[PDB]
Design a protein around this ligand. Structure first.
Ligand SMILES: N[C@@H](CCC(=O)N[C@@H](CSc1ccc([N+](=O)[O-])cc1[N+](=O)[O-])C(=O)NCC(=O)O)C(=O)O
Ligand SMILES: N[C@@H](CCC(=O)N[C@@H](CSc1ccc([N+](=O)[O-])cc1[N+](=O)[O-])C(=O)NCC(=O)O)C(=O)O
Ligand SMILES: [Ca+2]
Lengths: 241, 241
């Protein structure tokens, strides 16, 4: 019954994770957009002392999001939130019940967070070389069940964790967003269209076809525009190696 | 009934996490050391294609650890293993039952993994300045309950995740091991002994006092000697400014 408020922004794949999970859970919840990159509200550190989105409040009296209550629990870090929503809504089966299959979900989230996420971050924001990102994506793709299905078989929070980032890659590449070189943009677009990455393309289509994605996605062109408001995605800067 | 084998190495904090959790769970399990850094066994990629420790096998027929069975589940990534052990041993209460307290545990693991671990890596393996690491440690200390207790109050896998890294810091500093300068080594030793870091010292003492730590620790001097075998810790080498 306790209220959930998620502080969010359209561009953010980290925040997107949690919106997907809340939709899959069937939760009642409130979202509130926060201009974290240009004009952080003075009250925002009350909901997240790290000053990052997503931020979540849970419980406490029902209050406007821009007047957060000291009585609400303040939850930070998107993966903690995913596990939290799975704990709050056990009937939604946001994780398998079998411990080995639950471990496949946790492993997949850790493979993404530890080996892929940092490569997306560095290729897009620093223009580092794309080959180690493609290698990491090939590794992640190898963790998927070969025949189809999601990271742990049935849909789970592991797929909420990963699809925001993978789903952004294709339209960001097409719009030329990111500090990588022309040569690496070509390299990545060809690779992600190649037979080498057929399995992850089907995974992306399968995650995107779910209502939890459709109802938390502004559309490809609108997300690209959101992303162009990010200062670190400086138009006109590219790095070469 | 299903066997647990953990592929480990004394020096490794990541492997140490999983040993602590298996002790806390009261599990029956086998450990098998792997010389991952100098002489990887040609069979090891069958238990973990990433070629990293820790690696875990679960179930299948009882076999010698250097003859892994294709029938065992192969589990990778230390934090996935920690959640797995909690799932396997629910009566050992390795996570809280309360959703919010559980989220404190998951948040604390994410704070360490996202903001602290990379600072330990940079200072110890690259000799980058120590200040950002001290700052990250102060943030992580701020997440602890100020009056006492573990990350989520009661002991949880969150404390298994973090104590292997914190516990190595003091003996490694005392041994001058790591690529940071003597100046930054003194700076860090002084900082970690000051009242600024009293709370995280109490945290390290409280975690270390548990049998799960004693039974998985070689002793400070022995752990330093294991760490000196790590090529990337470059014993005898320090960067300056
Ligand atoms: N580990 C956290 C990560 C959350 C995070 O990074 N949030 C952002 C998204 S924006 C973002 C996030 C990552 C990177 N990046 O370069 O890695 C760049 C940007 N950006 O906006 O330029 C933020 O709010 N930053 C505000 C701040 O730190 O003051 C989680 O999982 O929830
Ligand atoms: N995310 C994984 C991380 C596991 C990991 O990094 N394991 C190591 C420990 S050694 C290690 C781990 C991290 C760093 N580091 O530079 O950060 C340096 C070293 N090292 O031995 O020099 C390993 O086996 N590496 C072998 C390989 O990659 O082929 C987990 O949580 O289990
Ligand atoms: Ca595979």
């Amino acid at each position: 019954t306790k209220q959930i408020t998620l502080y969010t922004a359209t561009f953010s794949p980290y925040a997107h994770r949690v919106r997907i999970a809340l939709e899959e859970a069937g939760a009642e919840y409130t979202t509130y957009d926060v201009d974290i990159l240009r004009n952080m509200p003075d009250w925002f550190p009350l909901v997240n002392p790290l000053k990052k989105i997503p931020a979540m409040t849970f419980g406490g009296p029902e209050v406007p999001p821009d007047q957060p209550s000291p009585e609400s629990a303040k939850i930070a870090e998107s993966l903690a939130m995913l596990e939290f929503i799975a704990d709050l809504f056990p009937d939604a089966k946001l994780l398998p019940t079998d411990p080995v299959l639950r471990a496949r979900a946790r492993t997949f989230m850790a493979l993404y967070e530890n080996y892929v996420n940092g490569q997306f971050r560095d290729v897009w924001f620093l223009g580092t070389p794309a080959d180690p990102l493609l290698q990491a994506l090939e590794m992640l793709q190898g963790a998927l069940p070969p025949d189809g299905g999601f990271a742990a078989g049935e849909w789970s929070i592991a797929d909420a964790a990963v699809i925001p980032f993978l789903a952004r890659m294709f339209p960001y590449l097409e719009a030329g967003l990111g500090l990588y070189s022309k040569e690496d943009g070509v390299k990545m677009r060809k690779a992600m269209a190649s037979e080498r990455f057929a399995r992850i393309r089907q995974y992306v289509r399968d995650c995107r076809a779910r209502p939890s994605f459709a109802n938390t996605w502004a559309g490809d062109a609108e997300q690209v525009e959101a992303a162009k408001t990010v200062p670190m995605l400086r138009v006109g800067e590219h790095h070469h190696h």
